[PDB]
Amino acid sequence: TIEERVKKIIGEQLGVKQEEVTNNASFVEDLGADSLDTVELVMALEEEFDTEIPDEEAEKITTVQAAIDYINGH
Amino acid sequence: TIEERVKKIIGEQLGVKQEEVTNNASFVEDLGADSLDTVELVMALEEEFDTEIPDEEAEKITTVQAAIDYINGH
Amino acid sequence: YHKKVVDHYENPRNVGSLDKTSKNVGTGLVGAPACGDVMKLQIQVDEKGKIVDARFKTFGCGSAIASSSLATEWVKGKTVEEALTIKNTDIAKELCLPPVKLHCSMLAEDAIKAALADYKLKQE
Amino acid sequence: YHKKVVDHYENPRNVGSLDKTSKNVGTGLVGAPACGDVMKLQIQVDEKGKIVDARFKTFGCGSAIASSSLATEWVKGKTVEEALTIKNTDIAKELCLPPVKLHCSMLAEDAIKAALADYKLKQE
Amino acid sequence: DVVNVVFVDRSGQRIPVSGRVGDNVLHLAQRHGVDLEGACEASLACSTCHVYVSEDHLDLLPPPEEREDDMLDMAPLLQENSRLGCQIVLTPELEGAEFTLPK
Amino acid sequence: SRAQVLALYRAMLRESKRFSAYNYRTYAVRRIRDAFRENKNVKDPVEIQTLVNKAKRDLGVIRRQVHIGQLYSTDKLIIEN
Amino acid sequence: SRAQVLALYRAMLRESKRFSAYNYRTYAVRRIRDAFRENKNVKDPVEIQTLVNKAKRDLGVIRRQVHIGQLYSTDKLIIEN
Amino acid sequence: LRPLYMDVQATTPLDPRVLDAMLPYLINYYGNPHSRTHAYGWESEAAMERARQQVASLIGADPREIIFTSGATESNNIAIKGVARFYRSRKKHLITTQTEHKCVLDSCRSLEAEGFQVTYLPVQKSGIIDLKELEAAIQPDTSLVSVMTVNNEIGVKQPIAEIGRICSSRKVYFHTDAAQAVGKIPLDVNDMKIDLMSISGHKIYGPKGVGAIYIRRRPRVRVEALQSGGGQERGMRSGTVPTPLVVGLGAACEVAQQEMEYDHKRISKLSERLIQNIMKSLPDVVMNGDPKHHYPGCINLSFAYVEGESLLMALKDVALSSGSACTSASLEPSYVLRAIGTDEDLAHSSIRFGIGRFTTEEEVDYTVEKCIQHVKRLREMSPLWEMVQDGIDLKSIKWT
Amino acid sequence: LRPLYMDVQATTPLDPRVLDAMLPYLINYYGNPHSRTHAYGWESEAAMERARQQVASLIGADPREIIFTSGATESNNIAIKGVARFYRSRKKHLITTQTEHKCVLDSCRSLEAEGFQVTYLPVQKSGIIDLKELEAAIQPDTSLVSVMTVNNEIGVKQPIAEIGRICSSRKVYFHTDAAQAVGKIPLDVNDMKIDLMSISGHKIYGPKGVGAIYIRRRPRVRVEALQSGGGQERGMRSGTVPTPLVVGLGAACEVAQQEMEYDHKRISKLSERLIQNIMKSLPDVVMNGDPKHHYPGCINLSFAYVEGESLLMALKDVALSSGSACTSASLEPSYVLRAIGTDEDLAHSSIRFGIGRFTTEEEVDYTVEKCIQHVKRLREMSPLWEMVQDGIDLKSIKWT
Ligand SMILES: *P(=O)(O)OCC(C)(C)[C@@H](O)C(=O)NCCC(=O)NCCSC(=O)CCCCCCCCCCC
Ligand SMILES: *P(=O)(O)OCC(C)(C)[C@@H](O)C(=O)NCCC(=O)NCCSC(=O)CCCCCCCCCCC
Ligand code: FES
Ligand SMILES: [Fe+2]
Ligand SMILES: [Fe+2]
């Protein structure tokens, strides 16, 4: 399941205990993560799902929902 | 001039004194050159004229006429 | 490390002990901890003159452990007289022990002889 | 090698010779103490007590060639008395010679002094 | 056929020993009470028969064998006059030779 | 200069993950993460430029060493299984 | 043989002409040419196969060293101008 | 699959930043640095001087005090033998400790054969020398004192600064073998009053076959050269200077100066993790050496009733070292462990663990797990363990 | 643009095949070859044994007779000092030549200070020693004879096999410095009856900082160790063996063995080209050393009435060497050229050209053209040339 895998990746990267991660939680505001955390989260998504995410779409990925939508679409 | 440059390259590579090279002299039968000589002549042509000669056309290049035709076409 | 020695450690055969009170059990205990090699070779004799069970416990290097294991394996199935025939040269030849490791074969032989002597003395 | 030494060799200044038969020319020819360095320094004097020309030829190292060239350049335009004030420390300061290279400067000073002595002896 | 040698125990005391040709130095010492070990019993594996040979008589000995030299280079306190006692054989050329036991 | 730092950080991480040797790979990822976390609050623009130049030299070294370690590579570690 | 040898010869020459260093480039080109001239009249198939294997191993060495010399390049010689 | 490397005290991997600095001189700048008439020599010479300044900067010295060698073995030989032979006419006495490296100990024995008197200081059970014995061992005839900074076998640290103060008060040259300390703990030759110091390249993630010795110039210390030749390295070490090697050594020193604090805190964390996790799981495990004067990167443990070589052979997926006579070609028991008063039984049981610049928590955890399981298996095979668990004292038992 | 390299006697560029063999041990196989308990050490030890076999194969020896060193300086010190000290009780006399390398000459001078007697054999004007003088110089208390194979200054070859026969007949150990000969001219230690040989890695397109010494085992040559330590290399050289360096030395020896005949033919032709083209265009040019017993790769020419370092300064685009005292740090004249009876004036005019494995015909022609032009420019500048061309003899002229 793409949903559970994406949520697991985000939880393992940002230490959200798998409970705080929701479909409307932002990477920076809701969860505790700076711009050095989100670069690595995006790269971990690229590692798990083989996809060279362009810089524009990477900076568009700011929320769990955005990452979910990108991974499901691609 | 393409003609003169090709003739000069062939003469320098095979030591034909710039006089023996004609438009119907073959590399092996007419001039004194083996296959080791040819791989070096074709590479010199590829160095002077920037062109990645395929193997199929390189094995077709057996005479001065063939080399001139290939260089002029490409 | 040599393949035979590594196999002797990685696959144990007869690691254990036996009852010292039983009249049909001999016990060998040779080497000193200060020296760094200690072996406990134990044999069992049935009603007739045949060895039926053997156990060992060895404190020492891989070569000492292999030497004790091979000594126990070769001891089981023989009689007292045939067990006395085992020399350190055979153990060293089988394990391909380099000259620095010749103590392991000598001390395994000494453990064999000590166990046999204990059996005879206590059977008297 | 240093900038000035390189320039003094690569760009000749007064390499040549002067007629020894001429009465108005003094010639020096001196050598190094502990190496193969030879300098020929020749100065010329006009009717009045002024040096109008000076030429050198040197068999030696690059620093020696540079020292001779600088000595000729500094001698030109001076009088005998003003030239006697030239010392090896000044040449060394201008060429930035390392400690192993002061033999060239001392040779250049000796050549200057020898040529001036030759001028006085011949003009007597 | 009698050859007289001198043994020098570690103390430095000189022990004159009389022997005959065809004997072994290590054993001649053992019979005459010299503290030379012969631990490997002349099988060329111990270096305990180590001895220093006198300067004059050294070249009169036969050149050592390959295993004799292999044992010597491990033998402690090696010198240019070192041989192994279990390989020297008494010969008429060895009269007056002095064997010194290394410390 | 936020964009240049986020881009150089990403380049340096994606570079270090291509090290063939386990020790070098784990080291370069850990060090870069720790070094950029160490300098998150540095205010002086001169110091920030000096750090960005050292990071560029560091990235050049990582590129050359990753390539060379690809040219001469060996078996993976027992922990990597 | 005629085709594989001629293919290996062309590959070796192509790779050697990419050496950054003048000494290595010139030596490699000359050595390859001389060796192939020396072994042109060999008749033993086993000897020919052994020579091909040796040349393949040298091709590998040439590829790796050309790359590392491109990673670490210097100025050209006074004679190349 | 290759085993994990946990043996940094034996040698270190090359730092990629060191290899990167080295490669240009292995490809293009191949000139001889003592060629003084052309550009290959000039650029090689410049690189050599740059590396010399890097080493001096790491240890707080002037560059003119750094002499490149082929390793810390040669550095120790130069220090001890050269100082002793230069000052032979007045000073015939040397002082060192019983726990020194063997290059130092063997140089001292060769001098003792050449006519010198040598005192070998004992150490306490902590592995640290006692300064009163050091003070009482000094003669008007004393030339040199040689005490190492970090022990290569158990990781204890000697009071180097105090030793140097005492030596300067008594007017005796002080040498320290720092081959296990350079780039790992802070060092300052002027604050510790050090006269000679040995440095090794491949103990600090630099290349093998290169070293350095620091020789003080104010006040001037002189040595008698051991290697004769053309007077290179100020006349103290003749031969061609290996430019790629000294360039690598300088690069490693610069990297160490930049990375020391970060490395030390990480290595301390990892060493605490290792020791706690092993002690928390196995009874009768003992650390050798004093924890209060101890470098975290070198951990030496004894596993009672299990032989060190047997445990090492069991741990076929982790690279380590022992202190067993059995692990030696000469069947030599560990003299360091003998000197710190270890029971001969527990000396055959010691294992050395190394944590360095590239160790990960993953490897530390794997090593601890494998060690726990194999120590349990070997104890279940040990007769000594059987007797100990069965209410028997080892000392009272007769052994043959 | 960088200058051309014609200074191969000083050092060589690294062979790319050698670097290709070396790099795996600089990246992945970094273990200590003396580590006996794990796979890093096992693979390092195996690589070291392979290299030892390669060197022994090049020189025709048993691999057990090869000892790795840090260079030919260390090899020469081990040979000379070790033999002299080991056989001290009976043999107190040494023999070498006046044209030997300074590592050898300085070892002999230090032994003279140590209480030994040293004879320095003169050479004939060809640079070759007289065998009759050698036979006359041997005493009943002679320990060692040391003659180099190829001279690094003028490239003349000594009659090594004849010298070895004489030494074996007189029962005297024979050492040869072969640093300039290994991999370039044929060597067989058994055919030449050599007892000790020095080898240098960076003279044979191998890495710097490594070497080897050959010590015969049948009959057994023994040496007294100079570097004390842990007993590595059979106890003859203590310290950690630098695995990447010894692997590179082995690779260089294997490549030299494969390449030697082709290299020698090519180098002889290029040397002939250089010499003939310089001689056909310049008068009063002389070759130092006999052509009949000459290694073609080392060419030594004196350009009369031109100073060597000024010529070198003119040839700024070609890296060369000179025997001029003005190129020395200590203002030291060329003792080799003094020994072969060269006038000092012509000894200050000496230029050494080095032709090696990677030299090219274009480089040779460029060098010849530049040398002709600059010698003509400096002769036009020289007072010696002026007096000679003006009908004057240099000897008769007074000099101050
Ligand atoms: P985000 O939450 O917006 O924050 C991102 C940054 C850090 C850019 C932001 O916090 C910021 O603007 N901070 C101000 C100062 C700043 O950006 N500092 C960082 C400077 S760059 C830096 O620290 C480089 C570190 C160098 C890496 C060396 C490691 C290489 C190892 C080599 C061995 C193989
Ligand atoms: P053409 O007229 O068709 O002839 C070409 C060939 C050679 C194919 C032909 O003459 C032929 O068939 N001859 C029979 C033998 C033969 O094919 N010889 C080639 C054998 S392969 C060989 O000799 C390779 C040599 C190895 C090159 C090593 C170069 C080293 C470089 C190291 C640089 C660092
Ligand atoms: S007696 Fe054992 S070696 Fe001679
Ligand atoms: Fe000069
Ligand atoms: Fe044992």
In chain D, what are the domain boundaries?
Answer: 24-124
Give yes or no for a contact between I51 and I41, defined as CB atoms under 8 angstroms apart: no
Question: Virtual CA dihedral for I375, I376, I378, I384, nearest 10 degrees?
Answer: 100
Residue whose entry in the numeric block shows the structure tokens 């690189």: H47
Is I124 within 8 Å of I130 (Cβ atoms)? Answer: yes
Are H274 and H325 within 8 A, CB to CB? no
Residue whose structure tokens are 């930049």: H258
Which residues on adjacent β-strands are paired with residue I174? I145
Residue G57 within any structural domain of the chain:
yes
Q: Is F59's C-beta closer than 6 angstroms to any atom of ligand 1?
A: no
Locus of tokens 């014995």: H133
In Å, the largest CA–CA distance within chain E is 35
Q: Contact, H207 vs I89, CB < 8 A? A: no
Name every residue whose Cβ is closer than 8 Å to that of residue H198 and which is 6 or more positions away in sequence: H72, H75, H76, H79, H175, H176, H177, H178, H179, H211, H212, H213
Only one residue has tokens 């078996």, namely F75
**Whether I179 contacts I197, CB under 8 Å:** no
Does residue C99 have a cis peptide bond before it, meaning omega lies within 30 degrees of 0? Answer: no
Q: Which amino acid is at C20?
A: K
Six token digits for residue H382: 């040990």
Q: Check if F57 has its Cβ closer than 6 Å to any atom of ligand 1.
A: no
Q: Which amino acid is at B69?
A: D
Beta bridge partners of I180: none
Could you tell me the two tokens for D52? 């109008």
The candidate with the shortest Cα–Cα distance to D60, out of D36, D40, D42, D41, is D36
Contacts of I340 (CB under 8 A, 6+ apart): I99, I123, I124, I125, I126, I127, I154, I288, I289
Q: Residue H92 CB: number of other CB atoms within 10 A?
A: 17
Which of E28, E30, E36, E46 most suits a substitution to test ligand 3, by most atoms within 8 Å of the C-beta?
A: E46
d(CA H307, CA H349): 5
Half-sphere exposure of H27 (CA within 13 A, CB side): 24
What is the helix (H) or strand (E) element at residue G3, kind and residue range?
helix G2-16
E63 contacts on I by Cβ (under 8 Å): 219
Cβ I223 vs Cβ I78: under 8 Å: yes
Strand ranges (E), chain I: 4-5, 66-69, 93-97, 117-121, 142-146, 173-177, 196-200, 211-215, 285-287, 298-303, 318-319, 321-322, 350-354
Domains of chain I, residue spans? 4-9+260-389, 16-256
Cα H372 from Cα H277, distance rounded (Å): 9
Calculate helix-pair angle for H243-281, H361-381, nearest 10 degrees. Answer: 60
Cβ(H151)–Cβ(H99) below 8 Å:
yes
Q: Is H326 annotated as a binding-site member?
A: yes
Report the residue count for chain B: 74
Residue C79 identity: T
Cβ atoms of H223 and H215 closer than 8 Å: yes
Secondary structure percentages of chain B, helix, strand, coil, to 5: 60, 5, 40
From residue I363, alpha-carbon distances to E6, G19, H177, I300, I317 in Å are 73, 18, 49, 17, 11
Alpha-carbon distance values, I175 to I101, I130, I332, I339, I346 (Å): 13, 17, 27, 21, 32
Hey, which residues does D27 pair with through a beta bridge? D42
Give just the sign of the alpha carbon dihedral H12, H17, H20, H25: negative
Distances, alpha carbon H353 to alpha carbons F22, H367, I42, I282, in Å: 19, 9, 19, 71
Residue H289 tokens read as 């050496």
Counting Cα atoms < 13 Å in the Cβ hemisphere of I228 gives: 21
Strands H173-177, H142-146: pairing kind: parallel
Query: What distance in Å separates the CA atoms of residue H309 and residue H152, rounded to the nearest whole number?
Result: 19
């290097």: which residue's tokens?
C61
Instruction: Assign F76 to helix, strand or coil.
Output: coil
CB atoms within 10 A of CB F74: 14
DSSP secondary structure of D40-85 = EEEEEE-SSS-EEEEEEEEES-HHHHHHHHHHHHHHTT--HHHHHT
Three-class secondary structure of residue I200 per DSSP: strand
DSSP string, A12-45: HHHT-TTTS--SS-BTTTTS---HHHHHHHHHHH
Collect all residues with Cβ–Cβ distance below 8 Å to D77 and sequence separation of at least 6. Answer: D50, D51
C-beta neighbour count of C101 within 10 angstroms: 22
Instruction: Using CA atoms of B1, B3, B6, B9 in order, give the dihedral in degrees to the nearest 10.
Output: -70
Amino acid at F47: E
Distance CA C98, CA C104 (A): 10
What is the four-CA torsion angle of I192, I193, I198, I199, rounded to 10 degrees? 40
Q: How far apart are CA I7 and CA G23, in angstroms?
A: 14
I300 is written with which tokens? 């030594």
Distant-in-sequence, close-in-space partners of C73: CB < 8 Å, separation ≥ 6: C13, C14, C54
Which residue matches tokens 């001078």?
I109
CB C37 within 8 A of CB C101: no
Integer Cα distance of I313 and D98 in angstroms? 17
Sign (positive/negative) of CA torsion G41, G44, G47, G53? positive
F40 is in an annotated binding site: yes
* The pair of three-digit structure tokens given for residue I126, joined into one six-digit string: 């060809």
Rounded to an integer, what is the distance from CA E96 to the centroid of its chain?
Answer: 13
Shortest CA distance to D43 belongs to which of D79, D92, D8?
D79
C-alpha to C-alpha distance for I118 and I142, rounded to whole angstroms? 9
Contact H241, H232 (CB under 8 A): yes
F46 in a domain, yes or no? yes
User: Which of F20, F72, F74, F77 to probe the I interface (max I CBs under 10 A)?
Assistant: F72
Report the C-alpha gap between H20 and F68 in whole angstroms.
10
Q: Which fold has domain D24-124?
A: Sufe protein. Chain: A (3.90.1010)
How far is Cα E6 from Cα E23, in angstroms, rounded to an integer? 15
Q: Which residues of D are annotated as a binding site for Zn(2+)?
A: 37, 61, 104
> Could you give phi then psi for residue A70, rounded to 5 degrees?
-65, -45
In a 10 Å sphere around its CB, with 0-12 CB exposed, 13-18 middle and 19+ buried, how is residue G29 labelled? middle
The structure tokens listed for D24 are 């108005």
G21 in contact with H, Cβ within 8 Å: yes
> Domain containing A68: what range?
1-74
Q: Which helix (H) or strand (E) holds C27?
A: strand C25-32
Task: Give the distance, in angstroms, between the CA of residue B3 and the centroid of all CA atoms in the same chain.
Answer: 11
Cβ proximity of H358 and F27 under 8 Å: yes
CA distance I261 to I186: 9
Q: Minimal CA–CA distance to I179: which of I156, I160, I202? A: I202
Q: Is H16-256 assigned to CATH 3.40.50.720?
A: no
Closest CA relative to residue H81, chosen from H103, H102, H107, H112? H107
| Inter-residue contact I87 to I101 (CB < 8 Å) | no
On chain A, the residues whose CB falls within 8 A of the CB of F9 are 36, 39
Tokens encoding G81: 């101008």
Question: What DSSP string runs through I237-288?
Answer: S-S---HHHHHHHHHHHHHHHHHHHHHHHHHHHHHHHHHHHHHTT-SSEEES
Nearest in space to D17 (alpha carbons), one of D68, D60, D63: D68
Amino acid at I253: C
Which chain F residues touch H16 with a CB distance below 8 Å? 24, 61-62, 65, 69
The alpha carbon of H348 is separated from its chain's Cα centroid by a whole number of angstroms, namely 21
**Which position has the token pair 């048993």?**
I62
Calpha distance I322→I334 (Å, rounded) = 9
Domain count across chain B: 1
> Of E62, B48, H343, which is closest to residue B70 (Cα–Cα)?
B48
The total of structural domains in chain F comes to 1
Non-local (6+) Cβ contacts of C80 within 8 A are: C45, C49, C51, C116, C119, C120
The partner residues of D42 in beta bridges, in order of sequence, read: D27, D55
Tokens of H311: 């445990």
Tell me chain C's radius of gyration from C-alpha atoms.
14
Pairing of the two strands I142-146 and I173-177 = parallel
Q: How many residues does chain F have?
A: 81
Domain I4-9+260-389: CATH superfamily is Aspartate Aminotransferase, domain 1 (3.90.1150.10)
Beta carbons of H142 and H95 less than 8 angstroms apart: yes
CA angle in degrees (0–180, nearest 5) for I177-I199-I112: 40
Partner-chain contact G67 F72, CB within 8 Å: no
Instruction: Measure Cα distances from D95 to D3, D42, F37, I222, I339 in Å.
Output: 8, 21, 54, 55, 35
User: How many beta carbons lie within 10 A of that of residue H255, not counting itself?
Assistant: 23
Quick check: H297 and H271 in contact, CB under 8 A? yes
DSSP-derived letter for residue I46 is H
Q: How many other CB atoms are found less than 10 A from the CB of residue C46?
A: 10
Look at residue F61 and tell me if it is in a domain: yes
Q: Residue I113 CA to chain centroid, in angstroms?
A: 25
Q: Are I168 and I202 in contact (CB under 8 A)?
A: no
**Cα separations in angstroms, I141 against D77, G50, H315, I84, I173:** 71, 55, 57, 11, 12
Q: CB under 6 Å to ligand 3: residues? A: E 26, 38-40, 42, 44-49, 71, 84, 86
Measured between CB atoms, does E44 come within 8 Å of chain I? no
> What is the per-residue DSSP string for E29-89?
HHHTT-----TT-SSS----SEEEEPTTTTTTSPPPPHHHHHHHTTSSS--TTEEETTT-B
In whole angstroms, give the CA distance from residue D102 to residue H275: 66
**DSSP of I217-232, one letter per residue?**
BTTB-----SS-SS--
Closest CA to E30 of E52, E48, E11, E53: E48
I343 CB neighbour count, 10 Å cutoff: 16
Ligand 1 pocket member F11 (CB < 6 A): no
Residue H130, CA distances (Å) to H101, H124, H292, H293 in order: 19, 7, 15, 13
Q: Rg of the Cα trace of chain A?
A: 11
Could you tell me the residue range of the domain that residue F58 belongs to? Answer: 2-75
Q: Residue H71 corresponds to which tokens in the numbers above?
A: 């390793």
Give the CATH number for residue A42. 1.10.1200.10
Backbone CA torsion sign across H222, H225, H226, H232: positive
Contact E78 I222 (CB under 8 A): yes
Q: Which CATH superfamily is domain E2-100 in?
A: Beta-grasp domain (3.10.20.30)
Q: Which of residues 22-61 of G touch I (CB under 8 A)?
A: 23-24, 26-27, 34, 61
Into which CATH architecture does domain H4-8+260-389 fall? Answer: Alpha-Beta Complex (3.90)
Yes or no: say if D43 and D54 are a contact pair by the CB < 8 Å rule.
yes
Distance CA D41, CA C20 (A): 112
Distance CA I172, CA I158 (A): 18
Question: Is D35 one of the annotated active-site residues of the chain?
Answer: yes
Binding site of C for Zn(2+), by residue number, is 37, 61, 104
